[PDB]
């Protein structure tokens, strides 16, 4: 179970067999290649199909991978694994990680020279519901933008236990499919140039070798890649994708998205794999698939008569408002070089019989879209089609594979696929659609799924002319409310020329590419209506299904929302529903919210340009109170380095009283909130009551989309007012329904967002945003309003454009034009590892609410380096990167395996280098150690106060000091003592005394703690919330120690204690319990005997009868008879040895002598040898030389001896060189795993 892998050119993309650098003499790229062996000189054969892709890695739970990388390239490269655990020796990234230089070699590997080692623990592998093998990847992490854009990306396959099973190696196949865009003009090698959308690195259908056998099934480990946004809707001509366990028509992928999809190949032949996004640039993503041979009640028949035929279509049957400094006019009003609102288009139209002389029932609300075509699995639909147009059209369904002609099976001419065969203004065709099983749902997804048909003789301009209609596909009014999101591009519609004649003053005025006229016919439509012309009446408590399609120009995804409402997606209640082009989803919701609402787009610059419509519904134990206001602040998006402009923002904060004056300051548990509002947490069935007061210059609003208004005011439909004026104080109250909260199959606590909605886009960038947790059942309680079983954090990913933030004109504060220093890629408003507040206990679930908001660019691909988490929607799937889309607020949980300081990135390479990053600290709760305060390791000069009474100097505050005057003391009321630890440290507690003066008892009965990082940024330790601040209980007398603990441990280097109640006089001796940042201070078990006597062994051991000084007993502070180790003879060649059984990171050695009889023995000088095997040895050299370590000066006092820079080894020997009277050792070892 030790799998060894030996990973380590010119490429034109179409010419296969350039990977023959193995062995034929006929752009600069650096890729991953394999090797046979540990001697780095022998190339392997790599398959045709893998192309540029790095070696596929296969393993299992509980194994260990051992890669050896050797850099043989111009530039440096690292090896960064995704979705496994590693030791910091293996992270292949460099940043402010507080990491020894030995553990930073991985961070950058120079030409020549690195093994990595990854762990795959039990908690790392897939669950029962997951695919048999999770799809991950690995890359160089020295310059993401550069490294990816140059060819550094391979596949990572993490399967559950059971790879050594005899797979039928006729099937299987299972080809990783990297879908990587490469921007060859911004890779390492260069000096714009071009940007290649590829499949496995080949363009224009050229990928060789992807052949699969017929009546079997093929799995697909799918990896997207790319260094900007942009999405891809990936299809396979005659075929469906199965992902998680859902029938999906496209694959929804986007930079570093990872899937395992499987599909099933029923038709022999060759089929086009291709991305379907309108932007023809996207048109390198194209590959062929060949499928071959290898070795060894009662179903209805529905009849529909449908005609293509032309009509005048009105996008706005409700007059707008001539006022044209507000675009509205241009797209719809009539006049000069503007058409208007009546465009001639062609539709699908249902008729009643073969005569086509009388029309079936039209219906307002479904405008433009053809007749509703229902059909359960098994049925047949006879779509009798008659043309009646001018151009030759057609009708064909995207979704069903088996669509042949009726009666005959043979096609009229040289027609490859019926798709491009036209129908002739006056012909009839007879089609047989047969709905089979492999088109339908899959138990785990909803009853019906939403598809569509359209003409395909010229796909583009036919759909653009208006040939579209809905097709449901289900399992064994009626079917109603169909919502079609459709940008109709009238600049391609066949009837462009005819329209000009009828609707213009003079067809003379040509212009044709005048971009105002062109962009005046891009009606951003819902169904067929625009700028609020599609009004649709629903009732109250109507349980309604919604069938939703995205077919149009569009190009970019749509992020669709209903105001005030919450639909059911994947058997889970969500709030926005992201839809790729040519994609359709079914949602289901109950109309429980009276009011007038707006359906619309959220995508910024469709929505303004018309894509609206109105929803008009109308009929036909505790109370948890939060006090929250919108207040203005200053904000620098990150101070640390880089030339420091400050920006005016506006933010949500929590207050205590109705009298908004005491602001309930936060810290530790909520420092991270940043620009974000406070956590407002409720359980289910209790009530939420938010009193909201607008400070701020402008007016703002409190909207969530959980806000449920009651059935007041019966006269009509009502636009919900909202709109809090800059000083007014509106109050919202609403009960929380079981449907606003976690399903029994989700996590204990669901997250929902909340913000202003007086200008959706502009005033999020200004800063109004916060998390609204909805916890489950009886989990969240106490007087804390929180789970407390789990540490919870909220991370809001977005790219603030301070040019769009309202207060931007108020920031004339600079002095007297490109924006790229006014944009910040900022998690919660901090950029570049600047975000504070992320402290988490060793082993202890942590729940992360992740939100993105804003413009289309925000398709962030969030990675937790070295960790994995679990997402839940009806079942539980392991993942390593969640592909956060704007408006979606997912909830995932992880436990942190390994101690240290770890990075939270956005794997969008551009975003990362633009600052979108931070870190968190995971500490061991078991690393409490004295910071050297009593032991004098902290030299006197670092303690510091502010007044001294007299001779009672702060340099005396040292626990256990004795005599006379023996402490700090001050007669000032407001005083403080301040300790400079000399570097950032982790503090878990503080032990506190106070001395005696002649006959009085002096002590602090009540203090407070301040700490600081720089030395003038002190903050009060409001530990564990409690109130305005933590009042600590001091002592009761001289002698006793009071051991307060810091259970959100203090991260600081200056700590400062403020006495608030003393007896007679503030007077203090103290000790600081703590740990270094990397948690390397604890014993490795000498004192706890955790190292059984068999692991300790030495070169000799004096024995006679009455003594027996065997190594086993040489443990620090052991007492009694014969309490230490004595070599059978004294000489500087002897050594004592300890087999740790594992490699350890030894960072020091405490060391002791022994009292015995009367003659005192201790070791003045020693040296240290180390080994990985137990038969080879090396002395710990340093700065040149064989170190000689100082020794004890007495036979009772322990002395520490830090090892710098600390050695790694599993074998440790101590070589005493010079001693006193006799060699005698007791010791502890300091370090960690």
């Amino acid at each position: 179970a030790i799998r060894r892998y030996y990973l380590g050119l010119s490429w034109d993309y179409r010419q296969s067999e350039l990977l023959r650098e193995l062995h034929d003499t006929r752009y600069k790229k650096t890729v991953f290649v394999e090797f046979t062996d540990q001697l780095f000189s022998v190339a392997r054969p790599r398959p045709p199909w893998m192309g540029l892709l790095g070696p596929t890695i296969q393993a299992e739970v509980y194994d260990t991978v051992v890669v050896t990388l050797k850099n043989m390239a111009s530039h440096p490269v690292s090896l960064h694994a995704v979705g496994v655990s590693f030791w910091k020796s293996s992270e292949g990234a460099e940043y402010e990680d507080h990491t020894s230089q030995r553990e930073k070699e991985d961070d950058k590997v120079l030409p020549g020279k690195q093994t990595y080692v990854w762990q795959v623990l039990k908690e790392n592998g897939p669950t029962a519901s997951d695919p048999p093998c999770l799809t991950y990847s690995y890359l160089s992490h020295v310059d993401l933008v550069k490294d990816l854009n140059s060819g550094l990306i391979g596949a990572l396959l993490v399967c559950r236990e059971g790879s050594l099973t005899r797979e039928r190696t006729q099937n299987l196949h299972e080809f990783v499919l990297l879908f990587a865009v490469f921007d060859e003009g911004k890779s390492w090698h260069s000096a714009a140039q071009p940007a290649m959308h590829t499949v496995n690195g080949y363009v224009n259908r050229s990928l060789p070798g992807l052949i699969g056998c017929h009546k079997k099934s093929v799995y697909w480990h799918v990896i997207g890649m790319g260094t900007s946004p942009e999405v891809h809707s990936i299809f396979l001509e005659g075929h469906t994708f199965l992902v998680r366990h859902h029938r999906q028509a496209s694959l929804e992928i986007s930079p570093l998205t990872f899937l395992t999809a499987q599909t099933f190949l029923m038709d022999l032949g060759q089929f086009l794999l291709f991305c379907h996004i309108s932007s023809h640039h996207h048109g390198g993503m194209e590959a062929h698939v060949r499928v071959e041979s290898c070795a060894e009640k009662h179903p209805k028949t529905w009849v529909h008569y449908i005609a293509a035929e032309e009509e005048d279509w009105d996008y706005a049957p409700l007059v707008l408002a001539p006022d044209d400094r507000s675009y509205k006019s241009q797209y719809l009003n009539n006049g000069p070089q503007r058409i208007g609102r009546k465009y001639k288009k062609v539709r699908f139209m249902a008729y009643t019989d073969e005569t086509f002389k009388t029309r079936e029932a039209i219906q307002h609300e479904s405008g433009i879209l053809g007749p509703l075509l229902y059909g359960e699995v098994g049925d047949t639909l006879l779509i009798i089609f008659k043309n009646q147009a001018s151009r030759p059209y057609n009708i064909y369904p995207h979704g069903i594979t088996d669509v042949r002609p009726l009666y005959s099976r043979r096609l009229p001419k040289g027609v490859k696929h019926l798709k491009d065969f036209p129908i002739l203004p006056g012909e009839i065709f007879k089609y047989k659609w047969t709905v089979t099983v492999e088109d339908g749902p899959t138990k785990s997804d909803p009853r019906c799924l939403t598809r569509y048909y359209s003409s395909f003789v010229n796909m583009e301009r036919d759909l653009a002319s208006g040939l579209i209609g809905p097709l449901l596909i289900c399992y064994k009014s009626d079917k109603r409310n169909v919502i079609l999101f459709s940008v109709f591009d009238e600049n391609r519609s066949w009837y462009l020329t005819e329209n000009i004649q009828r609707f213009l003053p003079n067809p003379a005025g040509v212009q044709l590419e005048d971009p105002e006229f062109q962009a005046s016919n891009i009606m951003h439509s819902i169904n067929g209506y625009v700028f609020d012309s599609l009004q649709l009446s629903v009732c109250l408590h109507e349980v309604a299904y919604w069938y939703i399609l995205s077919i149009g120009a569009q190009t970019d995804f749509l992020s669709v929302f209903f105001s005030g409402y919450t639909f059911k997606h994947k058997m889970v209640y969500e709030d926005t529903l992201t839809l790729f082009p040519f994609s359709g989803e079914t949602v289901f919701m109950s109309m429980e919210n009276p009011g007038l609402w707006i359906l619309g787009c959220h995508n910024s610059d469709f929505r303004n340009r018309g894509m609206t419509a109105l929803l008009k519904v109308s009929s036909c134990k505790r109370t948890r109170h939060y006090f929250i206001a919108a207040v203005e602040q200053l904000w620098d998006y990150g101070m640390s380095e880089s030339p420091v402009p400050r920006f005016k923002k506006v933010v949500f904060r929590e207050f205590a009283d109705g009298s908004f004056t005491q602001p309930s300051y936060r810290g530790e548990l909520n420092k991270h909130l940043g620009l974000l509002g406070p956590y407002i947490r409720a359980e289910v069935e209790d009530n939420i009551m938010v009193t909201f007061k607008n400070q701020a210059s402008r007016p703002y609003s409190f909207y969530s989309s959980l806000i449920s208004y009651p059935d007041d005011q019966e006269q009509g439909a009502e636009p919900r007012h909202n709109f809090v004026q800059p000083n007014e104080t509106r109050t919202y109250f609403w009960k929380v329904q079981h449907h606003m909260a976690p399903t029994e199959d989700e996590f204990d606590c669901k997250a929902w967002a909340y913000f202003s909605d007086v200008d959706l886009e502009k005033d999020v960038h200004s800063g109004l945003i916060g998390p609204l947790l909805i916890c489950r059942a009886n989990t969240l309680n106490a007087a804390h309003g929180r789970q407390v079983t789990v540490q919870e954090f909220a991370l809001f990913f977005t790219i603030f454009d301070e040019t769009k933030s309202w207060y931007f004109t108020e920031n004339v504060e600079r002095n007297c034009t490109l924006k790229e220093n006014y944009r910040f890629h900022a998690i919660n408003g901090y950029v570049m590892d600047t975000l504070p507040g992320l402290v988490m206990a060793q082993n202890q679930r942590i729940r992360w609410y992740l939100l993105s908001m804003g413009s289309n660019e925000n398709i962030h691909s969030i990675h937790f380096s070295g960790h994995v988490f679990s997402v839940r929607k009806k079942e539980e799937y392991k993942m390593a990167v969640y592909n956060l889309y704007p408006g979606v607020f997912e909830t995932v949980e992880m436990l942190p395996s390994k101690v240290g300081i770890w990075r939270i990135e956005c794997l969008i390479g551009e975003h990362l280098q633009a600052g979108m990053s931070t870190t968190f600290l995971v500490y061991s709760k078991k690393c409490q150690t004295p910071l050297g305060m009593a032991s004098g390791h902290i030299r006197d000069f670092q303690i510091t106060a502010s007044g001294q009474y007299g001779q009672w100097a702060p340099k005396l505050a040292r626990l256990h000091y004795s005599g006379s005057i023996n402490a700090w003391s001050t007669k000032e009321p407001f005083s403080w003592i301040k300790v400079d630890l000399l570097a950032p440290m982790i503090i878990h507690g503080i032990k506190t005394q106070g001395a005696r003066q002649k006959f009085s008892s002096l002590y602090i009965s009540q203090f407070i703690i301040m700490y600081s990082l720089d030395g003038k940024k002190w903050q009060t330790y409001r530990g564990n919330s409690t109130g305005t601040l933590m009042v600590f209980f001091g002592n009761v007398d001289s002698s006793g120690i009071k051991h307060n603990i810091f259970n959100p441990p203090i991260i600081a280097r200056y700590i400062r204690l403020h006495p608030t109640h003393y007896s007679i006089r503030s007077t203090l001796r103290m000790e600081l319990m703590g740990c270094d940042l990397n948690s390397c201070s604890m014993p490795l078990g000498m004192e706890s005997k955790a190292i059984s006597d068999a692991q300790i062994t030495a070169s000799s051991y004096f024995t006679n009868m009455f003594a027996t000084w065997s190594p086993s007993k040489a443990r620090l502070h052991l007492q009694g008879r014969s309490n230490a180790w004595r070599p059978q003879v004294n000489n500087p060649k002897e050594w004592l040895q300890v087999d740790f059984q594992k490699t350890m990171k030894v960072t020091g050695v405490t060391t002791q002598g022994v009292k015995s009889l009367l003659t005192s023995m201790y070791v003045k000088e020693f040296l240290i040898s180390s080994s990985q095997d137990g038969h080879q040895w090396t002395l710990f050299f340093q700065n040149g030389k064989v170190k000689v370590f100082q020794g004890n000066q007495d036979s009772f006092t322990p002395v520490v001896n830090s090892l710098d820079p600390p050695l790694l080894t599993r074998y440790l020997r101590i070589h005493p060189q010079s001693w006193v009277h006799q060699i005698a050792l007791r010791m502890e070892v300091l370090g960690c795993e």
Partner: antibody
Amino acid sequence: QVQLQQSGELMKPGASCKATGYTFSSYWIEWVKQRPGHGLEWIGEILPGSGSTNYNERFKGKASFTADSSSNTAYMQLSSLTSSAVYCTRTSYYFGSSYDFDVWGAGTTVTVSS
Amino acid sequence: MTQSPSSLSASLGERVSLTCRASQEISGYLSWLQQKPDGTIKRLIYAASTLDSSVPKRFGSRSGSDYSDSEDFAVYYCLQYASYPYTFGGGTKVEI
């Protein structure tokens, strides 16, 4: 292949070990001055990787210990000679190994007269 | 550290005499070597009862507090490696 050496001279009374094939620093070296007719006594152990030395009561005033790392050589200096002998060796820093006095010195001539 | 009888010659392949006696208790840390006339010094016995590398397998015993054909002409000195300062031996002279 473990080998030793010593530069093979005299002077008047009253006047002021190379090895290859192993690790020069992480092994002790020992000097010896076998007096004529008697036997072999003891000088001091030099650790060429640090400088730790344990001299002998006799040559305490005449057994100084110097060396150089990036050369793999070790010398010995004595002041004021007396009117003469003929005769280094290697010991390990840990107990257990067999690299203890395995290879011996190459011998050197030394005389004190006028 | 002396030798006994420090002078008992022989020839080639019989029971001669070459035994070492220590001042104090050493326990294991004794050796025995050979001196060639031109200055060549080798090693054989070490750690009481243990064999060497480039030396044949014929020589070797120990007991608290004492311990121990071909080119047979040397002065066998023993070695004491139990505590500093170290010391060799007296010398057992032989001649053919």
